[PDB]
Amino acid sequence: AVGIGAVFLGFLGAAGSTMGAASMTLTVQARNLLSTVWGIKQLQARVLAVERYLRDQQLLGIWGCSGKLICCTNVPWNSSWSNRNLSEIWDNMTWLQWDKEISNYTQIIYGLLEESQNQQEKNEQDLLAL
């Protein structure tokens, strides 16, 4: 128990790791998104960062995943987007490769999530009406 070292994966350390292993350290990435002429540029950069953070949070809230890092949904996975099974995704791939593969099927999923969440909200209101 003496002569042993302890090291933790820091910030982007899990970039090269698989998706399943990289999904266990989302908090370290999440915490780092927030934190005369030159002052103008610095303040513009700060405002842009704040705006990007607020945009991402607004999208998450609109999809109904507010306040969650992992939030599984009701939208089924169309096979046209991808054909690979879970064995070859969560244990034989990384997030960068997945982003490169799926970069052209992103907006339609967002619209589907928005419409689905609107439908769930309407149904919840109707249920609570009774």
Binding site: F11, G13, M19, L59, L86
Partner: protein, 441 residues
Amino acid sequence: AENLWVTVYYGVPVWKDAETTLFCASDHNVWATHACVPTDPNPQEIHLENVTEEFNMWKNNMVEQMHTDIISLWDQSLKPCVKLTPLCVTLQCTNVTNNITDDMRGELKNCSFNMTTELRDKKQKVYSLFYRLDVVQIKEYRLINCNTSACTQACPKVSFEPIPIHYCAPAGFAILKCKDKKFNGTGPCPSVSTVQCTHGIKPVVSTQLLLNGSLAEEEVMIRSENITNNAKNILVQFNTPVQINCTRPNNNTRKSIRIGPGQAFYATGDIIGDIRQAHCNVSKATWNETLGKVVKQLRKHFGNNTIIRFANSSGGDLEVTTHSFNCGGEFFYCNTSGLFNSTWISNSNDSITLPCRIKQIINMWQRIGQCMYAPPIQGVIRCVSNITGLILTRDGGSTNSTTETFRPGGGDMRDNWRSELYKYKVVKIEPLGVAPTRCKR
């Protein structure tokens, strides 16, 4: 059968190439550290394993940002200083011939003129020693800049010594550093780390030679955007430094002339003792060994039986035709002709002395209409520096001949910054991700 569903993750380790504005980090100077943040005493680096990135030193925006920031700082430093508007007068000059050698004949002019005083109804008669490069004949002369624009005098308290500067990125961005030795600035880097910000970079201004820089850890490195094209400069990084000793030996004197209410002009009074040329020294054996290494590395790209020649500069302005630098406030322009003069064929204590000149009216950056008058420095001046690289250009290059001739180059200061920021790049994080998963809300 798949029954998979979209699931959202926030905080995934994904990034994209992006451009942003970095800020200071540093531990009276022209490079003002007052508006620059303090640096962390213990910088942190995170080595990313299995991450191979793409790098291109010739498309880095950090070089442009550094150039703009350096120019802005230089402009800011000169604002609260005296403007030498009244100095455009008819000077009457005479040759200086007291204890001069055979190579300093005609370089110095003893010029008398009329000048204003604190009271606007009085005049005084004064004299000063000017350099031949500063005065143009109109026994009557005028300053070289008088028909282009009036321009200011550097305040005598600010120091020109470079200070290291670190560049740290904003929130939501990251700086990736390529730790792969032998990396020639373009292509894939298997070995990468993440840094909060870069090592201290001294903004050293020089041409034809890179001084007080960083050294390759393994061997001499040659870099070029397109080595087949002769219109692109070649950056050579040495493995070991070459010491160079420069000196101005004249025992100068400084005097102050009051040209108005709270405004002084610093003139060269007289020179004590003998008058001799300023010069630089570089060791001969070390230079020969360095050139041997350089030609050995050059043979890799230009054939194994090719004859490699080093010749003189082509021509142009004094800034680009000569190794120009600043040694303790005095602006030297020196003739690097004994260095790049030799031919190489495939198969003790003396030193090379470069004699060279000094100037006082300076157009630092490639601009017209703004000078900078350097006040004289009192006494003898001497400095020592490390040569750690070269900027070369290949002339001609047609297939008619099998001899390759390389000549010194320079002028553009972006090449000086490029040699330091070659292994860094900036990216922006993309924390939103989507994957298949087997729940359902």
